[PDB]
Amino acid sequence: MGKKLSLIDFNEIYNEENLITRANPIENHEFSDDGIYSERIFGSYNEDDDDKDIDTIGWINIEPYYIINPILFTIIKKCIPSINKIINYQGEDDYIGLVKFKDNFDDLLEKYTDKKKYQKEYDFLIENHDKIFINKLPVFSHKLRPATLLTGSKGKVLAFDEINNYYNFVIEYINQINEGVVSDDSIDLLLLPLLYNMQFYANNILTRIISEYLRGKKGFLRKNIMGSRINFSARNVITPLIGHPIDEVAMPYKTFAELYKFQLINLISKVKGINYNEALKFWEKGILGFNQELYNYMEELITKTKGGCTFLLNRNPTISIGSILYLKIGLIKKDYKDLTLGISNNLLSALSGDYDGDVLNIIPVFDNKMKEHFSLLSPQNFLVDRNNGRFNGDFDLQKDQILGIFILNN
Amino acid sequence: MGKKLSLIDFNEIYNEENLITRANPIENHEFSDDGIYSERIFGSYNEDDDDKDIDTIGWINIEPYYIINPILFTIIKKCIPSINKIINYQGEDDYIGLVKFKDNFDDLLEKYTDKKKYQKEYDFLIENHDKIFINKLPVFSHKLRPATLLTGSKGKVLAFDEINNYYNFVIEYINQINEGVVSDDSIDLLLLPLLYNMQFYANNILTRIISEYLRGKKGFLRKNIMGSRINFSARNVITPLIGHPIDEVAMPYKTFAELYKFQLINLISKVKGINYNEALKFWEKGILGFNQELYNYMEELITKTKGGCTFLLNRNPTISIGSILYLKIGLIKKDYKDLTLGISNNLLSALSGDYDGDVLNIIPVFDNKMKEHFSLLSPQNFLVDRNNGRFNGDFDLQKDQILGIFILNN
């Protein structure tokens, strides 16, 4: 909640064009162009025609009246504990009201504060005095806050989150206040409570957005920091491979098909002169069982692609150099049942994994530029131990390999 | 907030006759008979036809769905921390739903308990199983929640308590769920959001009742304990009176007129055979300045009244026996400017007051029964010291009087 960050002066950024001064949720059986769910300023389902993003932000005007800034409310509350009582209208001045509070705020801040307890807050109030009172409160895009239509016994009804209720309530309260000319002549003293409710609703709007961050905005973003879910990824068991170079590997039929699907569909469309959807039908048929034709397209990709077909192999935990390795797909297996990645025994020591049923993550790299940059993680570059500069025994001959050379030479 | 008192089963008290199912306060330009602001069920103070006191309470039916008891929510929350999460849909049973929570409450309560901390709360929940779930919500009389009449340009202004805005909102949510009989086709239950917000709204309504108790409801009762504001009361400065008995005192013209205003008008109406409104006009003229005629009626009243014309004189602090004394109105002063009570010097010592310009409180007693009962506080009854049974020196001769008797005898 409480964060130290730059504040924004709403009045400068406020745009009169996207101003919601109409509180009506619907107008004459239609979504109001001036309503909260406005296609003109916020956008609609046809968002490509609109060219208006989620960033589109609506505005509401409280002029000629000012409210306490919702973000700055808590610090004022700590400085002035009686803020909740004082704002309501029912020392020298007590419980004067919101409009009266504005006129005497500077004196009141000195009047009811403990300097030692809240000096930093008081200094902040002096620093950002101009931003204490707000004339316009922003409303975020209706695309973020959906209103799903439902059928009702009396009539079709729109279900929507409470945030929309908070916004429309605020606009409803303000709309009547500005209209009255001869009503207001002496009513102005009981008009103040109406403004008070608006301030509380805006505070809940601020609190709800804080909860919105918890509900898959900040939680999802920090979950992404916890674990970014990458497409074009795979998990596979490792099996020993013999007779092929160390960097090259053998990949199962199913593994290659999914990761290089779009590359595979490109070739089938070009070779057979078919639509992309029709090419997908060929790929779907191949997924079910081994067919030589799709294997031929897969074999051509590994054979003829520039830089080869390469990927990154990581064994978690990724705590050591060589945990993630840049490798090449030498062969594609012709057994549908075989679902094990074939790796050289020399790679195993660097990865620190075992052929005990452990699974390694496969992340293919496509761009030739990206392929080159990740080639610094290749096994060939890791033949040199980085601390010593000597050859790394991790990539040296292992148990079975050493014995054969020993019998040969010794 | 830490209060223990008997709970109420709303179904037992539920009355279909006093049922508020209409959220619209006004119907066809008149107060709705079924509305929240209903003259039909609550009444109108002006017309005698209402015959209904504030004790009248309206009723609402929430069936076929139940809400958590508003008073017991905090007690349930301490036992079950997930109550807030569970009721809404977004541990193992996190966010199951209100209806699912209602069915599985016994399982959830056993699941979420503190063995040492919340054993007392758990036992209370066992005691009040029947009162946990609420099917009927009470609505208090519209007479208590005033609507101040004001003119508005858009429309005539309807004034409402902060709670009153919530009341019309609460009724709307349930109204829609019941209208549909077969409409939902079991495909999508959106009733939970409507019920969910309602629980908080009723809870805030309950908190408002706590604030309403703070707003001069129970506090005014405490104001009576702190100081009951007694009408038919007076305050006057004390000046010595000589030549009259200890029990008798001299009362100013204005003091007697106001205190005995209703007694005096009865005599004036009878003697002149005039209406009480016309008799009041004469009383107003006499109060403005001294007139012999009103003094004569007052003089007759003090002479001929049954039990005499008597009052209670208290000097605060009323911490001693004799601080409040039952006294008699012997004479009425004929000087309008003279506003000093004439008391015997012997009374002063018991009262503990002095003739220094301090004021003593006058509480007149009217009923003959009360006069006898309060006569136990008379000076003659207190001539006997209750501690010893001896004569009370407070009522004896004082400094100036002792000197004369001493010169006489010694």
Residue A269: how many other CB atoms lie within 10 Å: 17
Please report which helix (H) or strand (E) contains residue B78, including its range.
helix B73-79
| A177 closest CA partner among A64, A264, A262 | A64
Q: Write out chain B residues lying below 8 Å of A151, CB-based.
A: 183
Q: Please state the φ and ψ torsions of residue B11, each to the nearest 5 degrees.
A: -60, -35
Q: What single letter denotes the amino acid at residue A277?
A: N
Q: Please state the φ and ψ torsions of residue A325, each to the nearest 5 degrees.
A: -130, 140
Test the B interface: residue of A150, A161, A188, A194 with most B CBs within 10 Å: A150
Contact A295, A253 (CB under 8 A): yes
Q: Minimal Cα distance from B150: which residue of A?
A: A187
Please report which helix (H) or strand (E) contains residue A186, including its range.
helix A184-187
Nearest by CB to residue B180, choosing from A152, A180, A197, is: A152
Test the A interface: residue of B21, B24, B84, B162 with most A CBs within 10 Å: B162
Can you read off the two tokens belonging to residue B35? Answer: 């509305």
Distance, in Å, from the CA atom of B293 to the CA atom of B273, rounded to the nearest integer, reads 16
Residues 6+ positions from B206 with CB-CB distance below 8 Å: B70, B71
- DSSP for A192-256 reads HHHHHHHHHHHHHHHHHHHHHHHTTTHHHHHHHHH----SS-EEEEEEE--SS-SSEEEE-HHHH
The answer to whether residue A156 neighbours chain B at the CB level (below 8 Å) is no
- DSSP for A138-156 reads EE--TTTS-EEEE--SSS-
Distance, in Å, from the CA atom of B27 to the CA atom of B36, rounded to the nearest integer, reads 11
- Torsion sign across C-alpha atoms A172, A177, A181, A183: positive
Please indicate whether, in this complex, the C-beta atoms of A150 and B197 are within 8 angstroms of each other: no
Supply the angle between the helices B292-304 and B261-272 in degrees, to the nearest 10: 110
Q: What single letter denotes the amino acid at residue A192?
A: L
Q: Write out chain A residues lying below 8 Å of B154, CB-based.
A: 176, 179-180, 183
Contact B38, B32 (CB under 8 A): yes
Q: How many residues does chain A have?
A: 410
The CA–CA distances, whole Å, from A234 to A223, A230, A327, A341, A345 equal 20, 10, 14, 11, 21
CA distance B32 to chain A (A): 20
Can you read off the two tokens belonging to residue B399? Answer: 């400094």
The CA–CA distances, whole Å, from B296 to A262, B273, B299 equal 117, 17, 5
Give the CA-trace dihedral at B144, B145, B149, B150, to 10 degrees. 150
- DSSP for B129-146 reads GGGSEESEEEE--TTTS-
| B268 closest CA partner among B285, B290, B246 | B285
Test the B interface: residue of A84, A151, A153 with most B CBs within 10 Å: A153
User: Which residues on adjacent β-strands are paired with residue A327?
Assistant: A311
Contact A304, A267 (CB under 8 A): no
Give the CA-trace dihedral at B202, B206, B208, B212, to 10 degrees. 140
Please indicate whether, in this complex, the C-beta atoms of B176 and A154 are within 8 angstroms of each other: yes
Give the CA-trace dihedral at A321, A322, A326, A331, to 10 degrees. 180
Q: Write out chain A residues lying below 8 Å of B188, CB-based.
A: 150
Please indicate whether, in this complex, the C-beta atoms of A153 and B180 are within 8 angstroms of each other: yes
The CA–CA distances, whole Å, from A116 to A4, A79, A123, B295 equal 20, 11, 11, 68
Task: Indicate the burial class of B356 (C-beta count within 10 angstroms; 0-12, 13-18, 19 or more).
Answer: exposed
CA distance B153 to chain A (A): 5
Distance, in Å, from the CA atom of B176 to the CA atom of B170, rounded to the nearest integer, reads 11
β-strands A157-160, A248-251 pairing: unpaired
- DSSP for A33-87 reads TTSSS-TTTT--S-HHHHT--TT--EEEE-TT--EE-TTTHHHHHHH-TTHHHHH
CA distance B155 to chain A (A): 9
The CA–CA distances, whole Å, from B220 to A122, B217, B225 equal 38, 6, 9
A313-331 burial code (b ≥16 CB/10 A, e <16): bbbeeeeeebbbbbbbbbe
Cα diameter, chain B = 113
- Torsion sign across C-alpha atoms A228, A232, A238, A242: negative
Test the A interface: residue of B149, B153, B163, B200 with most A CBs within 10 Å: B153
Distance, in Å, from the CA atom of A378 to the CA atom of A372, rounded to the nearest integer, reads 10
Residue A184: how many other CB atoms lie within 10 Å: 14
Q: How many residues does chain B have?
A: 410
Residues 6+ positions from A181 with CB-CB distance below 8 Å: B153
Distance, in Å, from the CA atom of A275 to the CA atom of B336, rounded to the nearest integer, reads 115
Please indicate whether, in this complex, the C-beta atoms of B152 and A187 are within 8 angstroms of each other: yes
Q: What is the 3-state secondary structure (H, E, C) of B285-330?
A: HHHHCCCHHHHHHHHHHHHHCCCCCEEEEECCCCCCCCCEEEEEEE
**What experimental approach yielded this model?**
X-ray
Breaks in chain B follow which residues, C to N over 2.5 Å? 90
| B36 closest CA partner among B190, B158, B209 | B158
Instruction: Tell me the Ramachandran region of residue B407: left when phi exceeds 0, alpha when psi lies from -120 to 50, beta otherwise.
Output: alpha
Start-to-end C-alpha separation, chain B: 73
Can you read off the two tokens belonging to residue B136? Answer: 């009927």
CA distance B118 to chain A (A): 29
Distance, in Å, from the CA atom of A408 to the CA atom of A404, rounded to the nearest integer, reads 6
Please indicate whether, in this complex, the C-beta atoms of A180 and B152 are within 8 angstroms of each other: yes
Cis peptide bond upstream of B317, omega within 30: yes
The answer to whether residue A162 neighbours chain B at the CB level (below 8 Å) is yes
Please indicate whether, in this complex, the C-beta atoms of A183 and B157 are within 8 angstroms of each other: yes
β-strands A310-314, B324-332 pairing: unpaired
Start-to-end C-alpha separation, chain A: 72
β-strands A26-27, A30-31 pairing: antiparallel
Q: Write out chain B residues lying below 8 Å of A157, CB-based.
A: 176
Can you read off the two tokens belonging to residue B314? Answer: 């208290």
Q: Please state the φ and ψ torsions of residue A366, each to the nearest 5 degrees.
A: -105, -50
Contact B331, B244 (CB under 8 A): yes
Please report which helix (H) or strand (E) contains residue A340, including its range.
strand A340-343
Contact A80, A108 (CB under 8 A): yes
Contact A128, A116 (CB under 8 A): no
Distance, in Å, from the CA atom of B346 to the CA atom of A325, rounded to the nearest integer, reads 113
| B251 closest CA partner among B237, B262, B270, B268 | B237
Q: What DSSP character marks residue B184?
A: T
Q: Write out chain B residues lying below 8 Å of A197, CB-based.
A: 162, 165
